[PDB]
Design an enzyme around this catalytic site. Sequence first.
Site, PDB file in Angstrom:
ATOM      1  N   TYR A 148      48.948  38.818  46.130  1.00 25.03           N
ATOM      2  CA  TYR A 148      47.675  38.683  45.445  1.00 25.03           C
ATOM      3  C   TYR A 148      47.602  39.594  44.232  1.00 25.03           C
ATOM      4  CZ  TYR A 148      42.686  38.243  44.682  1.00 25.03           C
ATOM      5  OH  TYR A 148      41.460  37.973  44.135  1.00 25.03           O
ATOM      6  N   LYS A 313      36.855  31.985  49.423  1.00 19.16           N
ATOM      7  CA  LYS A 313      37.338  33.015  48.527  1.00 19.16           C
ATOM      8  C   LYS A 313      36.376  34.202  48.543  1.00 19.16           C
ATOM      9  CE  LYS A 313      40.256  34.665  45.491  1.00 19.16           C
ATOM     10  NZ  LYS A 313      40.199  36.086  45.940  1.00 19.16           N
ATOM     11  N   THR A 314      36.950  35.374  48.765  1.00 20.05           N
ATOM     12  CA  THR A 314      36.229  36.639  48.768  1.00 20.05           C
ATOM     13  C   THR A 314      36.339  37.292  47.400  1.00 20.05           C
ATOM     14  OG1 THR A 314      37.847  38.383  49.274  1.00 20.05           O
ATOM     15  CG2 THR A 314      37.319  36.908  51.044  1.00 20.05           C
ATOM     16  N   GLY A 315      35.452  38.239  47.083  1.00 20.27           N
ATOM     17  CA  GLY A 315      35.688  38.871  45.785  1.00 20.27           C
ATOM     18  C   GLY A 315      34.704  39.984  45.523  1.00 20.27           C
ATOM     19  N   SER A 316      35.173  41.079  44.933  1.00 20.76           N
ATOM     20  CA  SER A 316      34.283  42.197  44.659  1.00 20.76           C
ATOM     21  C   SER A 316      34.676  42.989  43.416  1.00 20.76           C
ATOM     22  CB  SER A 316      34.236  43.135  45.872  1.00 20.76           C
ATOM     23  OG  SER A 316      34.649  42.466  47.056  1.00 20.76           O
TER      24      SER A 316
HETATM   25  C1  LIG Z   1      38.610  40.661  43.595  1.00 21.30           C
HETATM   26  O1  LIG Z   1      37.969  40.447  44.631  1.00 21.30           O
HETATM   27  C2  LIG Z   1      38.801  42.063  43.226  1.00 21.30           C
HETATM   28  C3  LIG Z   1      38.175  42.803  44.199  1.00 21.30           C
HETATM   29  N1  LIG Z   1      38.688  44.356  44.130  1.00 21.30           N
HETATM   30  C4  LIG Z   1      40.068  44.338  44.199  1.00 21.30           C
HETATM   31  C5  LIG Z   1      40.702  43.708  45.357  1.00 21.30           C
HETATM   32  O2  LIG Z   1      41.903  43.640  45.421  1.00 21.30           O
HETATM   33  O3  LIG Z   1      39.972  43.272  46.294  1.00 21.30           O
HETATM   34  C6  LIG Z   1      41.009  44.730  43.211  1.00 21.30           C
HETATM   35  S1  LIG Z   1      41.425  43.013  42.527  1.00 21.30           S
HETATM   36  C7  LIG Z   1      39.723  42.428  42.181  1.00 21.30           C
HETATM   37  C8  LIG Z   1      39.143  43.435  41.166  1.00 21.30           C
HETATM   38  C9  LIG Z   1      37.883  43.958  41.067  1.00 21.30           C
HETATM   39  N2  LIG Z   1      37.984  44.828  39.920  1.00 21.30           N
HETATM   40  C10 LIG Z   1      36.870  45.619  39.417  1.00 21.30           C
HETATM   41  N3  LIG Z   1      39.241  44.741  39.470  1.00 21.30           N
HETATM   42  N4  LIG Z   1      40.033  43.913  40.165  1.00 21.30           N
END
Ligand SMILES: *C(=O)C1=CNC(C(=O)O)=CS[C@@H]1c1cn(C)nn1
Length: 359
Positions: A148, A313-316
């Site tokens: 990922y 899909k998760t995300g932060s």
């Molecule tokens: C995507 O969800 C995301 C969340 N934080 C993470 C992760 O791996 O979960 C690093 S990759 C990505 C993100 C968020 N920010 C601020 N930068 N990359």
Amino acid sequence: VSEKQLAEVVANTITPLMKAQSVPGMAVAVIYQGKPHYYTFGKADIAANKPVTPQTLFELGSISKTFTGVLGGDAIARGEISLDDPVTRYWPQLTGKQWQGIRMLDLATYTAGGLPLQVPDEVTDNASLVRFYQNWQPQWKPGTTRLYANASIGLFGALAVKPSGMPYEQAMTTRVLKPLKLDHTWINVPKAEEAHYAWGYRDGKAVRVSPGMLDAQAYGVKTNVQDMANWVMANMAPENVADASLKQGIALAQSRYWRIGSMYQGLGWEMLNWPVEANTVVEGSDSKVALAPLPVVEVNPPAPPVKASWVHKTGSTGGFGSYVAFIPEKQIGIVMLANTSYPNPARVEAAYHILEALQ
Ligand SMILES: *C(=O)C1=CNC(C(=O)O)=CS[C@@H]1c1cn(C)nn1
């Protein structure tokens, strides 16, 4: 439907959740019986005492990659791009011998050979950007190891739009957002909309995402719970998408390119076969796995979307935490936006239960 029972299921799931993980605010949408059901809780901005609303903008974080995948997918169906084409086809200045066997699909589905999770902090421009990828060394060979990464799907996004001749943000707006009439979805929030922009909270400190190279492609999209619900719906039942290339785009994004255990990677989206026990998806959501390089098994030729899937899909970001899921065959779905980054498996914990109450 049982709207009473439905406001019960969500409230009784979300309130304990928010309490437990210290979440100031959340916006939820359940889609059921061809309809989005909106539920709102707590505060967008606590110092200002601004309540969460269905037009509250939340930072989507990594769920932006679903937009990156459909875009990329739309360009494919347009004929401007092909997944099998070497990356070097669209960026010939990428001169390393390392880049030899890597196709566009690889970049798109995290299987080049080890592109890193994020993009280095020193990469501040295209030169710095090129040196990075020029001097990046693999680990595994192409199509052998899923890891990922923003630096991976980010570059696909940026390369994918070049033949359109449009910058990434205008292409996204033109070919995907407007056609689906996602008019309150932004890569950059207009000054005239910031009042709808929630505040994020990290360590009891309000925070908002910062700009970074390839951000828009990998984490920088912001929405409200209405545009996000309609987004889930367009992808869930793409049959009433007019533009033939966008519907096909949605289709390529929910195609299975790679089997990684119980999971199958698409463009941005990820999938599992339905039915799927809770804990396999919940533990799969754990960072222990989520962020870990695993080997892969090609789906060749890639199978088109299977309705019988849990796609999600998760995300932060710093101060935000969101999650979306759907089951096309069941025509049921859910969106959960929140201005606090709380445990990912907690997220799927909740969404699964809420969804199962509708089966
Ligand atoms: C995507 O969800 C995301 C969340 N934080 C993470 C992760 O791996 O979960 C690093 S990759 C990505 C993100 C968020 N920010 C601020 N930068 N990359």
